[PDB]
Amino acid sequence: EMKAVATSPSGRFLKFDIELGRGAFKTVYKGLDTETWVEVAWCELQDRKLTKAEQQRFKEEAEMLKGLQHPNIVRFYDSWESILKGKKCIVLVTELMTSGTLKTYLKRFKVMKPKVLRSWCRQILKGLQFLHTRTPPIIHRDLKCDNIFITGPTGSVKIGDLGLATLMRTSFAKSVIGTPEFMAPEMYEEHYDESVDVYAFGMCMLEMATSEYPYSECQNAAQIYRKVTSGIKPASFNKVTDPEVKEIIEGCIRQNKSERLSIRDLLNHAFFAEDTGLR
Amino acid sequence: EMKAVATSPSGRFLKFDIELGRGAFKTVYKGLDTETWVEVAWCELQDRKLTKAEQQRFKEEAEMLKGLQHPNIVRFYDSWESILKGKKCIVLVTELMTSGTLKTYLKRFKVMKPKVLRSWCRQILKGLQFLHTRTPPIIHRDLKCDNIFITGPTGSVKIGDLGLATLMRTSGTPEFMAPEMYEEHYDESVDVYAFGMCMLEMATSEYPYSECQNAAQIYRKVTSGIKPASFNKVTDPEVKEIIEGCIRQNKSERLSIRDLLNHAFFAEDTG
Secondary structure (H helix, E strand, O other), rough: OOOOEEEOOOOOOOEEEEEEEEEEEEEEEEEOOOOOOEEEEEEEEEEEOHHHHOOOOHHHHHHHHHHHHOOOOOOOOOOEEEEEHHHOOHHHHHEEOOOEEEHHHHHHOOOOHHHHHHHHHHHHHHHHHHOOOOOOOOOOOOOOOEEEEEEOOEHHHEOOOOOOHHHHHHOOOOOOOOOHHHOHHHHHHOOOOOHHHHHHHHHHHHHHHOOOOOOOOOOOHHHHHHHOOOOOOHHHHOOOOOOOHHHHHHHOOOHHHHHHHHOOHHHHOOHHHOOOOOO | OOOOOOOOOOOOEEEEEEEEEOOOOOOEEEEEEEOOOOOOEEEEOOOOOOOOHHHHHHHHHHHHHHOOOOOOOOOEEEEEEEEEEEEEEEEEEEOOOOOOHHHHHHOOOOOHHHHHHHHHHHHHHHHHHHHHHHOOOOOOOOOOOOHHEEOOOEEEEEEEEOOOHHHHOOOOOOOOHHHHHHHHOOHHHHHHHHHHHHHHHHHHHHOOOOOOOOOHHHHHHHHHHHOOOHHHHHOOOOHHHHHHHOHHHHHHHHHHHHHHOOOHHOOOOOO
């Protein structure tokens, strides 16, 4: 009756044949929560030939994401494996962010305004502080302007795509010294903590402030790797003259992770000051 | 040892126009130490584009390699850069292992003999024991039968190609990826693991996980704790038990190098 073309296994969500966006290996359709009449994003992720072990790991992660409620985290409703009409995919139902990503929204503007930067970055930081104070802490690990989302008519900014990079990871991320047949399993382990999100946040803030992609002077990741592992900042950093924004970004992208500010230290900066209910 | 065709910058080593073999990233020629008249390996490496930083690092690492003197480590003499057929290459002079790698030597034989396995593996362990007890410890990180070498007429077995994997290496989101994400984490037990796979390769005459079609399947099995198919083709139960003790998933459960050196299977042939 709704002009819907599909229903979730639970029956709770409808899919409409209305495409709202296209990213790499995913299509976002307009959906509807039949219980609340709230419009939602019905995201179809191309099957990445996942095994039975990986499918189990994401199912436990997906159940934990369902519980996250925070104003700066995109809400996660449900997920399942679909094979309708012979198309194999994973469906994710999430909160619908009508203006897409910050990367997409920023394409409409020439120069960043300081009041906008303050508002967007404060919201991102509040979402990260929420994630880092869960039990156990959640580390995003892949924060960028293309997975932070915005709703144009409110200016609400929310972090999205939690767990997506691990779910869609086609190969082992980076190359390691060794021969696979002889390499112990612990050589594939990844060592990181909350400060990887602090570093990513600083690069996001630099991108927003300068309206350009960091390290665009490098022709390939080999040069980036050599610059980054040498502690050389992106050239776009030289364009930041506002001393507060400069000191904020500097405190995030320090090479030594133990010297970076925490998310709460960043939220304490006078640049992000707001109102506390005290007058 | 007549008619040299090149000399090292120092004047110490001569190159003869005699190609002894090819290896990982290298062509090996017969050379000579003019000071001692000992024949050596003159190894010409494939050209690599190294920054001024990486070049300095290799120079400092090479100077440390000169100090590693042990009967089961291939001795490193000298290195430099040379223009070879128009391209800048690294030349290394090392001890000459006349029979090549264990992998090559094994191709001449059909079935591994236990006394041979015990002798080759005991020598690899003594080499690892030496490397791991340097100050600071040296972890090989790429131990395999293709960079362990042998001299046929003595049965002497020596670990080589130290640091060659890192020198010859080539190629989250990169622009947003914190520098610590590029760090590699490992300790001495990664060499114990590779030793176990080396022992498996010798005992069965095939690469471990040869049933896998590509690296991602190996990654899936190794992270899952699934052993190579060749592990169950090991006929000797004592060899099988040692291999299992080296390739345990939890590195803290693996045998130490001292455990392996003092295992009865590797007891010296004094009687």
